[PDB]
Ligand binder design. Structure first.
Ligand SMILES: N=C(N)NCCC[C@@H]1NC(=O)C[C@@H]2CCCN2C(=O)CN(Cc2ccccc2CO)Cc2ccccc2CSC[C@@H](C(N)=O)NC1=O
Ligand SMILES: CC(=O)N[C@@H]1[C@@H](O)[C@H](O)[C@@H](CO)O[C@H]1O
Ligand code: NA
Lengths: 30, 249
């Protein structure tokens, strides 16, 4: 029930260097 | 990975390296979905045309690594495998349909900052995210061009329309695969290359911020060729087989 949440990023409220590019494709990609 | 970049440490805590035991040789990517189940591509285990038929005896997996060279003491782990399970309807002859395999670790691994399982896509995440134009992410230690990286490589790539995937190849594609990668007129590149097979294609859900594995690096015509696309095993469509195996054993 803890899958998908990275210790060193989501759990520390830290964003990796390119994940924003993915989130933005939800807006622009369609 | 072609035209990727160095992963940040811990960026892909579900990454798995599939090695041949002897000679110790990096074979494929894989992914950790629980403390003792690892997801990969069937063709990493069984591909007759390369006289490839590995058993649990032949293989090891390394978990939590970051630099292929450096030995990460107290960070990386090693596990032998109890049993492997290839999808029964795996079709290596015609089209690599159902290119999917499960590997049960001999002894469960301990989660950590560098070792954490990815989510399997549920029906809701599958419907909202697996759509053309949405980008996913591919990671591995495979070749940089069609040249071996030290640190895990990462690239983000958009999912492509099913008609465009079909017209890029003569292979008979199925609903158990999807394809991804940039088109020639979008002025960005990137793809998985050999070595990267069996690694994960992940997407981060905007709904709940978890990462889900929608694909397994399966096949392509070379690497990063204009008008060609990486093909990926459609993980959600084979989820019931994944679940029937894990519950059974
Ligand atoms: N995942 C990416 N996006 N990028 C990396 C892809 C490397 C690439 N695919 C593989 O490694 C997958 C399988 C596992 C062993 C080699 N396989 C291929 O030949 C499979 N085939 C499709 C196929 C499926 C079933 C039955 C027959 C075939 C025909 O072959 C890839 C392909 C598709 C269209 C035209 C040609 C080819 C062969 S091209 C060179 C070849 C190689 N000698 O390495 N394959 C690769 O380069
Ligand atoms: C797939 C194939 O060609 N041969 C395998 C063989 O390698 C394996 O050890 C044994 C287990 O049933 O029999 C076949 O499934
Ligand atoms: Na391409």
């Amino acid at each position: 029930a803890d899958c998908g949440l990275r210790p060193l990023f989501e759990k520390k409220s830290l964003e990796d260097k390119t994940e924003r590019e993915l989130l933005e494709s939800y807006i622009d990609g369609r | 990975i072609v035209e990727g970049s160095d992963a940040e440490i811990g960026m892909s805590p579900w990454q798995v390296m599939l090695f041949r035991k002897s000679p110790q040789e990096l074979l494929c990517g894989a992914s950790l979905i629980s403390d003792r189940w690892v997801l990969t591509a069937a063709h990493c285990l069984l591909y007759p045309p390369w006289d490839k038929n590995f058993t649990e005896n032949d293989l090891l997996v390394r978990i939590g690594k970051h630099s292929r060279t450096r030995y990460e003491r107290n960070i990386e782990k090693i596990s032998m495998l109890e049993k492997i399970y290839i999808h029964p309807r795996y079709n290596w002859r015609e089209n690599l349909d159902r290119d999917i395999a499960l590997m049960k670790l001999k002894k469960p691994v301990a989660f950590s900052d560098y070792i954490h399982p990815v989510c399997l896509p549920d029906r809701e995440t599958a419907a909202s995210l697996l759509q053309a134009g949405y980008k996913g992410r591919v990671t591995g230690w495979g070749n940089l061009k069609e040249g071996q990286p030290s640190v895990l490589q990462v690239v983000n790539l958009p999912i492509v329309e099913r008609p465009v995937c079909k017209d890029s190849t003569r292979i008979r594609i199925t609903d158990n695969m999807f394809c991804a990668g940039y088109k020639p007129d979008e002025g960005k590149r990137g793809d998985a290359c050999e070595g990267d097979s069996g690694g994960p294609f992940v997407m981060k859900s905007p709904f709940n911020n978890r990462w889900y594995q929608m694909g397994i690096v399966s096949w392509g015509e070379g690497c990063d060729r204009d008008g060609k696309y990486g093909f990926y095993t459609h993980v959600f469509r084979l989820k019931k087989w994944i679940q029937k195996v894990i519950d059974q054993f």
